[model samples]
Target: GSSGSSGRKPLQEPCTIFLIANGDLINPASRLLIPRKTLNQWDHVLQMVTEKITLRSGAVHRLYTLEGKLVESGAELENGQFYVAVGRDKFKKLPYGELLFDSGPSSG
Candidate 1:
């Protein structure tokens, strides 16, 4: 359960975005905290994706364009990667699985 509640906000610009992990998009009850600008970007990107393709759990993907009536959608990510595109610049790389799990399983 969450200790607080938050509402969705709107985006400031129309730009392509991407999602790499299932947990990238947090549910309302997750109590995840995101910056206002980040939230806007996420909302914009998610809206574009929902309108274009079906949302899945794990699939590296990207949003082509977000500037016109028909927002173009394209696949620009490989499986198992993390990235975010801002404007015309593409920022992406292989997934950092090292950050997900512990150094090693414990024996106790």
Candidate 2:
């Protein structure tokens, strides 16, 4: 059975694609799908700039839609640390052009 491993041990449940991090992709040729949760977390900045909605601490945030165009800008946090937040529907698409590229092969 697909749910069984060697020695008849029960297999672990499959991990959700959304739960995976962008850095988890091992094969460079494979396409990476950004989970909604990841998108939503970052979408907070978009909502603020577009609608002039200011979010205080403890406010629930999420990614709305992966549509429209996303504008990018950077700002300094209150702690004097520099951070980046995307604007509007910028997160609808992956930031680095296309996720897949023809990188040939790994030498290692």
Candidate 3:
């Protein structure tokens, strides 16, 4: 008998992205929530994402899009899309104002 303690919380939602290291699924739901305001700079976003993932996985992991693209630390992030990455591959997608923009009418 083994004590089940992986040190990771049970995923509350279906994972949109996969985090694999050395051919193992570290976490399926390791997705990054990137706000529009932070998309302007890659370094900022990278640091933010790294911190988030580190808190969850307890280690510093690299980032990437879903298409196996390497996210440059100097690259700017687009809006409405999500990102995925790890020690290996990653992915992401589009849009800006629609998702980040306020839906309600302007207040005078």
Candidate 4:
């Protein structure tokens, strides 16, 4: 026996991006869940996060890519990718991920 079905596709999974700052991963870190069939620019995402963090902590911040590269606000974001934000001074140093991952067990 065959079952009848509608010509429709199943809903896709939401895309999630992460933000890390001040040597710590932000709480409620699962920031944005991009809806299906929608476009999200990097600048908008940066503004949203900056505003949220500023309102929450009353301080301004800067945005960066997961690789610790400075991100232009106007850039577009890819699904399931990670991003980062940090204080202005911190952004100046850049490559914060290096400081984070460079720490390895010393060979004594």
TM-score leader: 4
For model 4, give the 10-residue run with minimal summed lDDT: 21-30
Residue lDDT tens for model 1, 1-108: 132355753443322333223232222111122233433354444444443333343222443212211222323322333333223224323232433433553575
Give the per-residue lDDT of model 2 (tens digit) for 1-108.
343345644432321211111222332221223333233334443443323222233221333212322223211112221112232222323322222334555696
What TM-score would every model get versus the actual structure? 0.20, 0.17, 0.39, 0.44
Best candidate (score: lDDT):
4
Which residue pairs overlap in candidate 3's backbone? 64-90, 64-91, 65-90, 65-91, 65-92, 66-90, 66-91, 66-92
- lDDT (10s digit) by residue, model 4, range 75-104: 345565556566556653334344434455
Query: Could you arrange the candidates by TM-score from highest to lowest?
Result: 4, 3, 1, 2
Q: Which RMSD values do the candidates have, in order?
A: 15.2, 16.1, 16.2, 8.8
lDDT of 3: 0.42
- Models sorted by lDDT, best on top: 4, 3, 1, 2
Better of 1 and 4 by TM-score: 4
Instruction: Supply candidate 3's per-residue lDDT for 92.
Output: 25
Error of 3 at 101 (Å): 29
Report the C-alpha displacement of residue 74, candidate 4, in angstroms. Answer: 4.0
Which parts of model 4 are misplaced by more than 4 Å? 1-15, 25-28, 34-44, 51-61, 92-108
Clashing residue pairs in all predictions, respectively, total: 0, 2, 8, 1
